[PDB]
Point group: C3
Amino acid sequence: FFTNKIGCNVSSPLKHVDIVGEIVEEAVYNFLIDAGDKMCVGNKIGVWKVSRKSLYAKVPKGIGVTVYLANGRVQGRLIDIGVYEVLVEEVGDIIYIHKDLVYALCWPK
Amino acid sequence: FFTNKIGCNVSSPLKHVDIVGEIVEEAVYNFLIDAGDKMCVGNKIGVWKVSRKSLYAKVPKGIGVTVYLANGRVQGRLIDIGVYEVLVEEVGDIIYIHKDLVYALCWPK
Amino acid sequence: FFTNKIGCNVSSPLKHVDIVGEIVEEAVYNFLIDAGDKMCVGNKIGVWKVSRKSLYAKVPKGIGVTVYLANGRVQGRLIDIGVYEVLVEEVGDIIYIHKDLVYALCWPK
């Protein structure tokens, strides 16, 4: 579906997921959204409105990120993105989130 | 589990998912529910009460459908069902939902 | 990620998932948590705070379990754990939950 949607506007219709931007690049598992003051990696496992394996290498390590889930969000310092998981520091603790639950991961430009 | 449950009554115990019907057919990834005034394709990735690869070919294109998610629902005109995704028109916009998040997709008979 | 976290404290940061314990064993798809008065199998598909294929063989059949989902919980008598699914009796009815939606499954010691 996303293959030929580069340049399309895209938004999350989930009320708690404040993402409205443009699709800039697309990868097998996820796609990159330019949201103006922030970028996001949007998961193909997701609910998206529209109007090379992964792009997570784009997310800056050490930066404060917002990981959106289907039912909430995790905000903290990005530690690492592994093969299956995103690790974010909240307080002095590591929050692990499996990638299949990461609906979107945004960071400021 | 669903292999030998044809003829069983089945319901969604999620409060916002108003599905109560009978299992009529079963496929590798999903099963078909006759709910009287509506049919549904129920995802094997789901929470179900009970008391050939896919059945999504049964859903009429162009019809108004209700896509139930774990935490809400998407209602609009069915555009297409692809290999990985369901596309529904809400307003004049395409809502994409990955199949793994489609808990059930119902349409009126 | 979990490979070398045996002995780490682990908790669910989801408000409705009251799990705080220690990682005792780890398997390809899930890991075992000792929570003092209860044990849990935690899914690697999950959100976890930290500070051989599966361990579901540890859960006693017939026991009252609590199956935590991303947005709620199912409590009843464990019937079976199959390859893809957990079956729990609530009332005199079978509740099926696909394993990918089982965030954690706890039982009392």
